[PDB]
């Protein structure tokens, strides 16, 4: 029951400061433009200890399956090859991605009927809000 309140199908409804976050990450111009348009469907499910997060979008489709605390390989929508570790901290999913000596942290939390995603790269944060699809 660890992630019950995350499970479901979610649709992106707002994004703030995502271009600046992507710039901080190192995403190039064309990818930032096309990625910034997308309104993905995020589909979260749990089967035993395995959590799956899928993103269905007009830009890219992605999928990760993982066990909390256990590092895995991830290919991000912008085509970074990262090493990821996801934990639960006080009911927040905390996802750290490491690549090329860099690090970014993505937090996903339930707030009211929304799922709020905060993406942080150094001093730059983007907030992406999802509602149930
Ligand atoms: O909206 C969401 C929901 N869950 N995780 C994320 S991860 C942030 C992300 C997404 C797409 C691109 Cl292209 C880049 Cl650079 C980074 N974002």
UniProtKB/Swiss-Prot annotation:
Subcellular location: Cytoplasm; Nucleus
Residue stretches spanning the membrane: none
Effect of residue 24 to D: In a breast cancer sample; somatic mutation
Superkingdom of origin: Eukaryota
Note on domains (UniProt): Forms a beta-barrel structure that accommodates hydrophobic ligands in its interior.
Function: Lipid transport protein in adipocytes. Binds both long chain fatty acids and retinoic acid. Delivers long-chain fatty acids and retinoic acid to their cognate receptors in the nucleus.
Name listed for the protein in its UniProt record: Fatty acid-binding protein, adipocyte
Biological source species: Homo sapiens (Human)
Gene symbol of the encoding locus: FABP4
């Amino acid at each position: 029951h660890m992630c019950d309140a995350f499970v479901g199908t979610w649709k992106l409804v707002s994004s703030e400061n995502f271009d600046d976050y992507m710039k901080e990450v190192g995403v190039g111009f064309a990818t930032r433009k096309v990625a910034g348009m997308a309104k993905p469907n995020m589909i979260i499910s749990v089967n035993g200890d395995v959590i799956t997060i899928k993103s269905e979008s007009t830009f890219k489709n992605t999928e990760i399956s993982f066990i909390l605390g256990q590092e895995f390989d991830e290919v991000t929508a912008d085509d970074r090859k990262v090493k990821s570790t996801i934990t639960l901290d006080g009911g927040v999913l905390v996802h750290v991605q490491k690549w090329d000596g860099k690090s970014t942290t993505i937090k996903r939390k339930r707030e009211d009927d929304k799922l709020v995603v905060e993406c942080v790269m150094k001093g730059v944060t983007s907030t992406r809000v999802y509602e149930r699809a």
